[PDB]
Amino acid sequence: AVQQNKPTRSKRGMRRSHDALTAVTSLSVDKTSGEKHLRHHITADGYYRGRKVIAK
Amino acid sequence: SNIIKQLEQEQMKQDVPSFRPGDTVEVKVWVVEGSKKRLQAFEGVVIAIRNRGLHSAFTVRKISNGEGVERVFQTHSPVVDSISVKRRGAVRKAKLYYLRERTGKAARIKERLN
Amino acid sequence: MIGLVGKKVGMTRIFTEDGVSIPVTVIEVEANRVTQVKDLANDGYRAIQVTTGAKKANRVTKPEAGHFAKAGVEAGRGLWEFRLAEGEEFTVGQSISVELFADVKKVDVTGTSKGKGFAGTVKRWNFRTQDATHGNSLSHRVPGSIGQNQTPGKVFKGKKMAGQMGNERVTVQSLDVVRVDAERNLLLVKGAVPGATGSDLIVKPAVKA
Amino acid sequence: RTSGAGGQHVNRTESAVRITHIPTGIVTQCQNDRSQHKNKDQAMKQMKAKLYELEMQKKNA
Amino acid sequence: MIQEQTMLNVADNSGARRVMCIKVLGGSHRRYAGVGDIIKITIKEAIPRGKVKKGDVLKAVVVRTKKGVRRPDGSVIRFDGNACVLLNNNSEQPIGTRIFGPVTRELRSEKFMKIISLAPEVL
Amino acid sequence: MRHRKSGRQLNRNSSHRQAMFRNMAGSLVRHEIIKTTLPKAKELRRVVEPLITLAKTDSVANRRLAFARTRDNEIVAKLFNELGPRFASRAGGYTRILKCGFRAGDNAPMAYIELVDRS
RNA sequence: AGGACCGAACCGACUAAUGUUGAAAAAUUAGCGGAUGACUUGUGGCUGGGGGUGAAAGGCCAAUCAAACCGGGAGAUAGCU
RNA sequence: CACAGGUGGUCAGGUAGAGAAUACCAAGGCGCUUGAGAGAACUCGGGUGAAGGAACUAGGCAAAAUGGUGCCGUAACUUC
RNA sequence: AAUUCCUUGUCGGGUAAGUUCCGACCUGCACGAAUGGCGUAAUGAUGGCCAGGCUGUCUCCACCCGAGACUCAGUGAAAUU
RNA sequence: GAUGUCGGCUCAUCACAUCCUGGGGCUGAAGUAGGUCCCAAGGGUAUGGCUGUUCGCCAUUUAAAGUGGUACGCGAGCUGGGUUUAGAACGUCGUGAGACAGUUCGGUCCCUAUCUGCCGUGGGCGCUGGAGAACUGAGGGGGGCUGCUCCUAGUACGAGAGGACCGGAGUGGACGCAUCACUGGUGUUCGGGUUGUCAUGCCAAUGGCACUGCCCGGUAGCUAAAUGCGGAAGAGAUAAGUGCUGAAAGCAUCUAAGCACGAAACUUGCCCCGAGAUGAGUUCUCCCUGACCCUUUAAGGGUCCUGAAGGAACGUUGAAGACGACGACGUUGAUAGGCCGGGUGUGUAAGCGCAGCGAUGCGUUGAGCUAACCGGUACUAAUGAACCGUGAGGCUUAACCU
Ligand SMILES: *C(=O)[C@H](CCSC)NC=O
Ligand SMILES: [Mg+2]
Ligand SMILES: [Mg+2]
Ligand SMILES: [Mg+2]
Ligand SMILES: [Mg+2]
Ligand SMILES: [Mg+2]
Ligand SMILES: [Mg+2]
Ligand SMILES: [Mg+2]
Ligand SMILES: [Mg+2]
Ligand SMILES: [Mg+2]
Ligand SMILES: [Mg+2]
Ligand SMILES: [Mg+2]
Ligand SMILES: [Mg+2]
Ligand SMILES: [Mg+2]
Ligand SMILES: [Mg+2]
Ligand SMILES: [Mg+2]
Ligand SMILES: [Mg+2]
Ligand SMILES: [Mg+2]
Ligand SMILES: [Mg+2]
Ligand SMILES: [Mg+2]
Ligand SMILES: [Mg+2]
Ligand SMILES: [Mg+2]
Ligand SMILES: [Mg+2]
Ligand SMILES: [Mg+2]
Ligand SMILES: [Mg+2]
Ligand SMILES: [Mg+2]
Ligand SMILES: [Mg+2]
Ligand SMILES: [Mg+2]
Ligand SMILES: [Mg+2]
Ligand SMILES: [Mg+2]
Ligand SMILES: [Mg+2]
Ligand SMILES: [Mg+2]
Ligand SMILES: [Mg+2]
Ligand SMILES: [Mg+2]
Ligand SMILES: [Mg+2]
Ligand SMILES: [Mg+2]
Ligand SMILES: [Mg+2]
Ligand SMILES: [Mg+2]
Ligand SMILES: [Mg+2]
Ligand SMILES: [Mg+2]
Ligand SMILES: [Mg+2]
Ligand SMILES: [Mg+2]
Ligand SMILES: [Mg+2]
Ligand SMILES: [Mg+2]
Ligand SMILES: [Mg+2]
Ligand SMILES: [Mg+2]
Ligand SMILES: [Mg+2]
Ligand SMILES: [Mg+2]
Ligand SMILES: [Mg+2]
Ligand SMILES: [Mg+2]
Ligand SMILES: [Mg+2]
Ligand SMILES: [Mg+2]
Ligand SMILES: [Mg+2]
Ligand SMILES: [Mg+2]
Ligand SMILES: [Mg+2]
Ligand SMILES: [Mg+2]
Ligand SMILES: [Mg+2]
Ligand SMILES: [Mg+2]
Ligand SMILES: [Mg+2]
Ligand SMILES: [Mg+2]
Ligand SMILES: [Mg+2]
Ligand SMILES: [Mg+2]
Ligand SMILES: [Mg+2]
Ligand SMILES: [Mg+2]
Ligand SMILES: [Mg+2]
Ligand SMILES: [Mg+2]
Ligand SMILES: [Mg+2]
Ligand SMILES: [Mg+2]
Ligand SMILES: [Mg+2]
Ligand SMILES: [Mg+2]
Ligand SMILES: [Mg+2]
Ligand SMILES: [Mg+2]
Ligand SMILES: [Mg+2]
Ligand SMILES: [Mg+2]
Ligand SMILES: [Mg+2]
Ligand SMILES: [Mg+2]
Ligand SMILES: [Mg+2]
Ligand SMILES: [Mg+2]
Ligand SMILES: [Mg+2]
Ligand SMILES: [Mg+2]
Ligand SMILES: [Mg+2]
Ligand SMILES: [Mg+2]
Ligand SMILES: [Mg+2]
Ligand SMILES: [Mg+2]
Ligand SMILES: [Mg+2]
Structure with a gap:
């Protein structure tokens, strides 16, 4: 149910070893609008693989 | 699969008649005893038919000597010699399992004319 | 004796002329082809590495390609070894067929069992459930005790517990070979073999016999 | 162990005693006393008595 | 698929009407008895003047079951209810002189040959 | 396990799920494009496309069926x-x-889902 | 007619599983008993601590009861920790 | 505590129903202030289950079952 | 026997098998006559025992539907040491 | 300044003083079946009735229903019948409060796991250039039960009754593994019947809610009660035991020299894991063959170019899966959805027409609809890239090649 000894900070650190975030490897650049975006997602301006798929 | 289908089709009997549920059918089956294959008849109502090509089957119910008996025949088994529709019945269901809890005058199923 | 690498097509049945319906697993044993031959001199033991099926040219890696190329053979979906007995020779290019099984009566079939995922002890170890009612509190399918008191003061190794079930190599033995068919590259064996439909199956002549 | 009684000690200890004759198939239980030994003694006595009674019965018959 | 506590009907004319299976014989921990399997039974309901008497513990052979019997080709055969033929404990041969209702090929052997002969239908 | 089973449950009870698909599909039909969660969008493909297919053959029966589906x-x-x-x-x-x-x-x-001849 | 019967509201609280660092310092859901009476309920009033009240269980008397709570005697006393 | 609790009175629509029960609705009011996925074990709350049918268990606990109106019919015993 | 220690008394019933149950006997450790005796229809969320029905209670678990559990984002405790 | 108690349940694990199965000696061992002792712990080793029971008696099984240890194993795993509070009553003791290892009826069983442990499953680094595969097998785990029938043979044995060893064949029980072809279960994602009610203007037809409203069927999957397979044979070294030859001890003696047989135990054989086997192994294949500074001059640091093999990431995903992981595919494309065709399931849709006063019936019609299935099909989505990974790989000996 509960600890018998306060665990160390070292232990905590070790535990958190795997809690790190991975940044996006790289962003795709749209061919037409030249603006960066996530692979397989549309851009913020609304392009996807060159064509304008959405208004705003 | 295709291969499986091929395997199956070459085993299927081609002469199987057009019975439905309710039909009073008469299945003749091969019976070994000693060293003499003979042909035992099993006349009853078809209560359920299961269509799966080679794996096809049908459940014939009768009342042998007071006791009710269902028998499930594997349709394309060579142990069945001959299926034959002695009468054809008008039922509204694919399966006549309500006939298990019905006897005599209740278990009647009207004949399907035309 | 060596064995072949087939693929589980599916199950079906063979009605015998007598009456009996034999449940058969259908194994599509495409022409296996030798890629490499091992020996006591170089490798340290006698065996044959074989491949089977086709593979995508765009998907096969360079190293993989090279190995195949050296052999002088089409690239297949995998490579599998077979230990050779004394008095068994194979050239590198050679293609072994299901015709090899014509003489055998029984076979051991090996393949990866179906994955049941994380299984509890009722499924995985056939543990008896506890009482469904009569007072039971939150402990119907739970594993019960897992040890004794202060001695030994630990759970012993290989205690039966919940965990991953299936998706592992299993081997059914002494399966009767119902029919060999060189025409369609089929082997029919009586009874269910491991794995799902489309899974690879190493068929070998039965060691027990 | 004895029937019912009262405590932890009672629950654990095996004071009750059931003596049995292998030739005759007679039995004598005792769990009157706390002391196993005493019970045994009592039980033994009972058994002895029973044997005597059986011998007398036989004689009578 | 008869087990301890299962009430069967009687096929023979021994005297008994209703009998309860008290033991499936022929193996430790043996769960069920299907057709052709000998069971120990006790007579729960009997006729006024028969061979057997109520509360009589004796053997019986199971001749029909509701679960049924599978054949080599895979053709199952069932019945509407479970039944048995009473037998002597020692001699293992029927008490009655007359078997009612249909039985099966499963039953036929050197042991239960009388029964099959008696029976009106053998499926 | 759930080998070979189709159909996202979408942390909803069946009836509710059905309702939402009916609504969503209708919305899509109306607007020819909608923004929803990706799984939901995916699910919708197996409701809207069939409806569309049904609508190709214009018959009274077909219309009725469509109505039943959508309402x-x-x-x-x-x-x-x-x-x-x-x-x-x-x-x-x-x-x-x-x-x-x-x-x-x-x-x-999120994901947009849109009819193919929208623009 | 009825401390009659079946049954909602209303009053209760027999079983159950749940909860047991709760949604809740006693509840929940499913069933359960009474339901024109020795019923139930609102509003106001009265009984006070060796005192009350008690169809009586040492029950209840503000989440406190084999002697309430608050303040005081008071830093009681403690051969014990 | 923005707490599954407690809090007296009045109003009392429709269709079915004996009904203020119950079901579906009106007038009116709400979706309960974390969502999104996934679809392991195990827990909770439910559904179904071959054959058997209390063998479970301290105990049929829990479930399952019974369930309405009319008419026939209804034993011991009884303070009638 | 809500009372019997010896005691699972003995005999009978019920069950394939009954330390419980019912009927007897009386050998009442240690019943007994308003701290009432013996009966008793009716009533009981009362104790014990047996039967029919019914059933996942169980043989022996299987599948399914939802709420957690698991992963992502936001917020963010606790006993213990 | 707390170590929760009998029994039940669930899970066990060890000992051997062995209950069954295996091996053997002696027998007051003819045979069958026993008695007794020695070896042997591989596996196996009952369901019920009664009682809170452990125990035990009884019923019926079984090859056998072993005896013990483990906090008389196991309540941060369940129960709470017994015990061990408070209510109440009987007997009994007491003047009484009350009391009894007398009896009786009633009576709250908390804990989200830090560490060890164990079951699973990943990330990091390592294994000395990097990469993709296939292996070897040190070591570890799993498995190991047994009945009945028939033959041998009514032979051997025996006065008869009865009735074998050895060896062989079949078919079961229990347990385990796999699987879904069959028989079935489930199948709130398929079809249908049907009650009440609300809605779609109404009719007809549909949908919502009522536990999936209540039912009847049922596809895929998952599944057991379904059906395949398993336990071995063999080999080695032995146990008790049995010997052979053989002296010490002219004989005798299985032992001292030497040689042999000998069991479910041991080591193998069968199945699975397994090179973190840091003792980090092997085999095959693939990939990289450029500059110049710099100095604290060494397996040193830097900047331009360069970026392979392959990997990851992202996406479409899976009979893989808690998450990671593993597998498949990404237009040079069937990976998913859709679509087409089929199958399966349900059981003759709607609309129209005819018959009927009408409920309804009949025709069109085995119709319509049909999930997870099968075979096809690029219609939609799986993007051109980008990212990590480099640029021939230390020293010392030996042997070769030249
Ligand atoms: C024995 O006296 C005791 C229980 C008493 S309950 C008031 N057992 C151990 O602590
Ligand atoms: Mg401590
Ligand atoms: Mg973490
Ligand atoms: Mg899986
Ligand atoms: Mg159990
Ligand atoms: Mg609780
Ligand atoms: Mg529960
Ligand atoms: Mg799929
Ligand atoms: Mg959620
Ligand atoms: Mg609903
Ligand atoms: Mg009243
Ligand atoms: Mg009260
Ligand atoms: Mg309530
Ligand atoms: Mg009432
Ligand atoms: Mg008191
Ligand atoms: Mg008072
Ligand atoms: Mg108070
Ligand atoms: Mg006071
Ligand atoms: Mg005082
Ligand atoms: Mg003072
Ligand atoms: Mg002080
Ligand atoms: Mg709120
Ligand atoms: Mg509130
Ligand atoms: Mg109303
Ligand atoms: Mg209401
Ligand atoms: Mg909320
Ligand atoms: Mg779930
Ligand atoms: Mg149910
Ligand atoms: Mg059932
Ligand atoms: Mg049934
Ligand atoms: Mg019944
Ligand atoms: Mg019982
Ligand atoms: Mg029991
Ligand atoms: Mg109940
Ligand atoms: Mg119920
Ligand atoms: Mg007395
Ligand atoms: Mg007594
Ligand atoms: Mg008696
Ligand atoms: Mg009595
Ligand atoms: Mg008295
Ligand atoms: Mg007097
Ligand atoms: Mg008096
Ligand atoms: Mg009185
Ligand atoms: Mg009362
Ligand atoms: Mg804190
Ligand atoms: Mg302490
Ligand atoms: Mg020994
Ligand atoms: Mg001996
Ligand atoms: Mg061994
Ligand atoms: Mg009973
Ligand atoms: Mg009992
Ligand atoms: Mg009992
Ligand atoms: Mg203990
Ligand atoms: Mg513990
Ligand atoms: Mg305990
Ligand atoms: Mg607990
Ligand atoms: Mg503990
Ligand atoms: Mg108790
Ligand atoms: Mg008291
Ligand atoms: Mg005393
Ligand atoms: Mg109570
Ligand atoms: Mg309770
Ligand atoms: Mg690793
Ligand atoms: Mg081993
Ligand atoms: Mg199946
Ligand atoms: Mg299938
Ligand atoms: Mg079915
Ligand atoms: Mg269903
Ligand atoms: Mg199915
Ligand atoms: Mg409706
Ligand atoms: Mg209408
Ligand atoms: Mg509505
Ligand atoms: Mg000699
Ligand atoms: Mg000599
Ligand atoms: Mg000699
Ligand atoms: Mg040897
Ligand atoms: Mg390595
Ligand atoms: Mg193509
Ligand atoms: Mg069809
Ligand atoms: Mg319709
Ligand atoms: Mg029509
Ligand atoms: Mg007319
Ligand atoms: Mg027609
Ligand atoms: Mg279609
Ligand atoms: Mg396809």
């Missing part, structure tokens, strides 16, 4: 009079998913 006469009309003939040549694939980032309120991965 908005307007939607049905749209399907039969516009989308059915509009997708007459097209053999499936009436719709298009485009992934569109993550919803602010709960980081739920």
